[PDB]
Structure 1
Amino acid sequence: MLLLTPGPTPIPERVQKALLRPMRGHLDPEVLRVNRAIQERLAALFDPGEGALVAALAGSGSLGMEAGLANLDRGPVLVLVNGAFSQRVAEMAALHGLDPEVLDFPPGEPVDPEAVARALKRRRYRMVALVHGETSTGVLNPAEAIGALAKEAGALFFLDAVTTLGMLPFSMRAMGVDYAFTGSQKCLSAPPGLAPIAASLEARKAFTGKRGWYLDLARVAEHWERGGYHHTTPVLLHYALLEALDLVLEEGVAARERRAREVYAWVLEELKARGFRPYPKASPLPTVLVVRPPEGVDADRLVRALYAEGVAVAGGIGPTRGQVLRLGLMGEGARREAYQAFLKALDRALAL
């Protein structure tokens, strides 16, 4: 089964093999050494600024997402929404009593900075939340521009970097980001189960809220910065993530973005040639190709047919439910050989 979902992603042999290394206690000096290395690799990708907390939470990307909200002292929080995942940020913010104010944008369209600027003049916010790449719509939001607006407004800047960190240019310092996160199984192409996160010194100063034990970033810091015991970590996944992070830096984000954009263009033309139409109206996310099926072809039925042909892709989600196919172009998903197989399988499905 060829894995072309927009997360999880195919895992490099070198990475999956690291899972075979001898198991060790989570406080074993070697594991601690591995952990400091992970922080170094993550710091290079995140570019969090001095005094930041860098770690890999023991859970999925969603855990990373929730940690940056549940640890916040107070709201309100301006949540910029234009997809299923930014909608999840809003749901979490509401749950933790952070008094979120949702600013909606049409699914398939990027968040407009000018609209955000107007909203930031309406009320004072403790934090502004945005999803860099909305996986549910295949839209890339203008994170840098919004970060600048957030800094001017004196608000912390929360940014979901799942579809961008490890594949497209990214810098917390440059974009004025205070909290960034991702999952191990996205652009990093590592086994799922970990959530790399980064909190700027300013975020840490504000992260005094106590609403959860497992996601308490102060407890996480004790382990990642001082080698103390928080809870047992998924050691084998740590080995794998470090291996995956090295693969990323070895290739370079610049080259990885080119590999994604290159495949994105080719596949889109092949699909348009078969009657497919892109979903994003503007600012398409290069790491996730979202397309509407040819006339008369049901999206979900096509997803099932593809599976029968040996290929796994995602159907719509949230605002795009049952209306599209979402193809992964992050990590090992962005490969010529992989999509040539996809197209062959796709044609077999369309033939029926």
Structure 2
Amino acid sequence: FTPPPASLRNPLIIPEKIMMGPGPSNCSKRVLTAMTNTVLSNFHAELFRTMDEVKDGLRYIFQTENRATMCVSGSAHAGMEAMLSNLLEEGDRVLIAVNGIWAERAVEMSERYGADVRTIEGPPDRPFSLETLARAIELHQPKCLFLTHGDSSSGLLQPLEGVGQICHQHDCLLIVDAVASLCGVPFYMDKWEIDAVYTGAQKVLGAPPGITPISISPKALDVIRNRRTKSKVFYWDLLLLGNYWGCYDEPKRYHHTVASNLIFALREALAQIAEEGLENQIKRRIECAQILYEGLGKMGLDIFVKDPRHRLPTVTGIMIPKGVDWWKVSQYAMNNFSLEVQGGLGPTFGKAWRVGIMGECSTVQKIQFYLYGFKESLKATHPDYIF
């Protein structure tokens, strides 16, 4: 036996940080400690009980009644992978509206799954219009439309009202990525006639990463039932996964081992948002964004999505002013305040920082602190910047 590594001899030390990037967010002490519960057998009654509480929690936050509501055992990417491998067969047409990094990933996945990918470009800072989409649908007769709802690479919030209805008219499924919007802005899976949605644990909910709530409509469920070939990935085949999640009128069968610890944590995160109520949580985040916009204005700082009406409240791009080294600000923030001041991604790469109003930092005091430590970080770091 070639010797054990020395690096494992020190204890593990992870410092506390104020996670105000657009992910992952701070989880409440209650959510974090729920993770320390006993890992359960796939068929223990108490896991099933907890899994049911989660499905309820998910129906509340997605605002759906979908029986096929469950979690994929993976990060939000795996919700994306799941929607695409379940809903498309080789040669199917999928329409992706691309104006952010996520829609590009979707493009990358659909290609791999052997779908015939149709895209429309858009400015990273301006939503696609109802008509733009409608036109693209008629034009391509797709099986699915994929839309990013809240785009954490830009700060862009894509309106959704009416979009599904159009898709339905052209026999198309609406798939929406709500990873960065859910619990940050109104969302109505059912009213907005949306067929397949996913969020992420570690964004607005303030749950730990590695598990991804999803939901599909009876309509979508049926498209899967009627595939001519098995979907490509067994691990997130939704007939099989849905089965173990008790979404169908079938006895549950072992599929794969779920991450009990992550499921406990997610349950508590949903319990938190239930006790306070969706509406208040969304309100709280809107108000925090307002305070954020004011404080940024007052520093003569620019926001990537210029037009306020288009802004996702939970992620804001702050434009690096002309003279400034963005990374130097962040190091200062981290070292002096333990403040997470996140760089850019895709559209915002090298052009803005990104601030998240998520999880435990969605409070007035938390936004103030951010403003304070951000400013102090800029000031100490670029002494010639003018406010």
Settle same-fold status: TM greater than 0.5: yes
Question: What pairs up with 1:198-213 in 2 under 5 angstroms?
Answer: 198-207=215-224, 208=227, 209-213=230-234
Q: 8 Å contact 1:313–1:328 — kept in the other structure?
A: no
Give yes or no for the alignment of 1:251 onto 2:267.
no
One of 227, 233, 236 as aligned partner of 1:215: 236
Partner of 1:237: 262
Q: Deviations over 1:117-160 (max 9, x none)?
A: 11122121101110110110000001123222212222000000
Q: Distance in 1 between matches of 2:174 and 2:107?
A: 14
One of 53, 59, 69 as aligned partner of 1:54: 69
Q: 8 Å contact 1:81–1:111 — kept in the other structure?
A: no
Give yes or no for the alignment of 1:341 onto 2:347.
no
**2:275 partner letter:** E
Partner of 1:91: 108
Partner of 1:164: 181
Q: Deviations over 1:250-271 (max 9, x none)?
A: 1112111111111111112111
Give yes or no for the alignment of 1:264 onto 2:292.
no
SS across alignment from 2:213: strand
One of 121, 127, 140 as aligned partner of 1:110: 127
Q: 8 Å contact 1:109–1:281 — kept in the other structure?
A: no
Q: Distance in 1 between matches of 2:362 and 2:333?
A: 18
Partner of 1:81: 98
Give yes or no for the alignment of 1:278 onto 2:303.
yes
Partner of 1:101: 118
**1:130 partner letter:** L
Give yes or no for the alignment of 1:34 onto 2:62.
no
Compare 176-185 and 69-78 and name the one that shifted more: 69-78
RMSD, matched Cα: 1.5
In structure 2, runs of 5+ residues without a counterpart are 1-16, 382-387
**Number of aligned residue pairs:** 351
Partner of 2:317: 290
One of 178, 195, 217 as aligned partner of 2:195: 178
Give yes or no for the alignment of 1:224 onto 2:245.
yes
Per-residue deviation, 1:303: 2.7
Q: 8 Å contact 2:330–2:377 — kept in the other structure?
A: no
Q: Distance in 2 between matches of 1:297 and 1:289?
A: 18
Give yes or no for the alignment of 1:316 onto 2:344.
yes
Q: Distance in 1 between matches of 2:110 and 2:198?
A: 16
Q: Distance in 2 between matches of 1:71 and 1:346?
A: 44
Partner of 2:210: 193
Partner of 2:10: none
Q: Distance in 2 between matches of 1:164 and 1:71?
A: 23
Give yes or no for the alignment of 1:65 onto 2:65.
no
Q: Deviations over 1:37-69 (max 9, x none)?
A: 11111112223345x311111110110111000
Partner of 2:329: 302
Change in Cα spacing, 1:301 to 1:152, as seen in structure 2 (3 Å) is: farther
Partner of 2:30: 14
Q: Distance in 1 between matches of 2:334 and 2:323?
A: 19
Q: 8 Å contact 2:317–2:348 — kept in the other structure?
A: no
Structure with the greater alpha carbon radius of gyration: 2
**1:149 partner letter:** I
**1:275 partner letter:** G
Per-residue deviation, 1:73: 3.7
TM (norm. structure 2) is 0.87
Partner of 2:142: 125
Structure 1 consecutive aligned stretches of length 4 or more whose deviation exceeds 6 Å: none
In structure 1, runs of 5+ residues without a counterpart are none
Partner of 1:332: 360
In percent, how many aligned pairs have the same letter? 32
Q: Distance in 2 between matches of 1:257 and 1:295?
A: 34
SS across alignment from 2:190: helix
TM (norm. structure 1) is 0.95
Q: Distance in 2 between matches of 1:316 and 1:289?
A: 10
SS across alignment from 2:35: helix
**2:210 partner letter:** G
